[PDB]
Structure formats: structure tokens, C-alpha cells
Amino acid sequence: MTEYKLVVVGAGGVGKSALTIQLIQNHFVDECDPTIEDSYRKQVVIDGETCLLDILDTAGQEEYSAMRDQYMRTGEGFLCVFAINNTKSFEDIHQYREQIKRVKDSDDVPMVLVGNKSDLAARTVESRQAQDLARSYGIPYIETSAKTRQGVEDAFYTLVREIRQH
């Protein structure tokens, strides 16, 4: 079956695992082992195509992992995630993208910028700010909540659409 290899990167606590697990298990986790990193597979129909998403949910851990290296190199699309109530997480984004540009040796990597925790009445990073970080990158911005699923399918499926047209 057609597959897409997706990688989810971003600062600690942005909700990378929560997003993954909403897409896959259709529920919210109120917390998660902050340190665990693996890939999960998920069947979805996207734009009418039956396919599998193989999603490495990264952790922040003191580098080297061969598995992590393998996904950073053969991964077709990256979700770059910050939380909209955490300005440091948003500032970090450029480190994550830059590491992806290095491992993929390209300025044109299927990516999507995700502002998670859109449910919160806690916003510190304004939407237009992220629109502009994304536009400058030439990639889409999408705001999500793992708590309510708003934007989640859209984050992932826009990423697939970016992998396809690459």
C-alpha cells in the first residue's frame, strides 16, 4: 500500500506526541512520556487515496539515534511544531527547520508549520507572526489542537499533499 513517511519535530512539550496520538488513536492524552521516540503507522484515506502514514514522533533526547537518523534522511515530509502559548517553542522552530534542510540537503523540503494548543485562551504567539514565518519559508501554516482535533487531520494531510507535489 502507498505510504508516506512523516516526521514530527519541535521543542519539548509543544504536543508532538499529542498530535500524533490524536491522528492515530483518535483521543487526547493529558500527558505523555516526554522522552519516548518511535514511529507509528496509520491507515487513512486522503483525497480519496487509501494509504499509510508512517510517523516518527521525535523526542528531544541527547543526540545520536540511528533510527532517528534514518527517518531524518528518508522522511518525505516534516511537521514543525510550536505551541501558540509558548514563545520559546516558536523561536526554536528555525533550529528544527535548519537541521531538516541539512539532513535533506535542500531548501525545498515538504514541511508544514503547526501552531498547536489552539484551544487555549493562553496565546502568546500571534497567528500572523506564524503566517509570516511560514510564508518566508514557502510552506503552509496550520493551527491545531490535540485536545479537540481542530486542524489535526488538516496538518497531516496538507503535509501529504506537499510530499506528493514535491
Ligand SMILES: Nc1nc2c(ncn2[C@@H]2O[C@H](COP(=O)(O)OP(=O)(O)O)[C@@H](O)[C@H]2O)c(=O)[nH]1
Ligand atoms: N490544551 C492543550 N494541551 C496540549 C495540547 N497538546 C499537548 N498538550 C499538553 O502539552 C503537554 C505536552 O504534550 P506532549 O504530547 O508530551 O508534547 P511533546 O513533548 O511535544 O511530545 C501535555 O501536558 C499535553 O497534555 C493541545 O493541543 N492543547
Ligand SMILES: *CC(=O)N(C)CCN(C)c1ccc([N+](=O)[O-])c2nonc12
Ligand atoms: C508519550 C507516550 O505516552 N508514549 C510514547 C507511550 C506510547 N504511545 C504514545 C503510543 C504507543 C503505540 C502506538 N501505536 O501502536 O500506534 C501509538 N500511537 O500513538 N501513540 C502511541
Ligand SMILES: [Mg+2]
Ligand atoms: Mg513526545
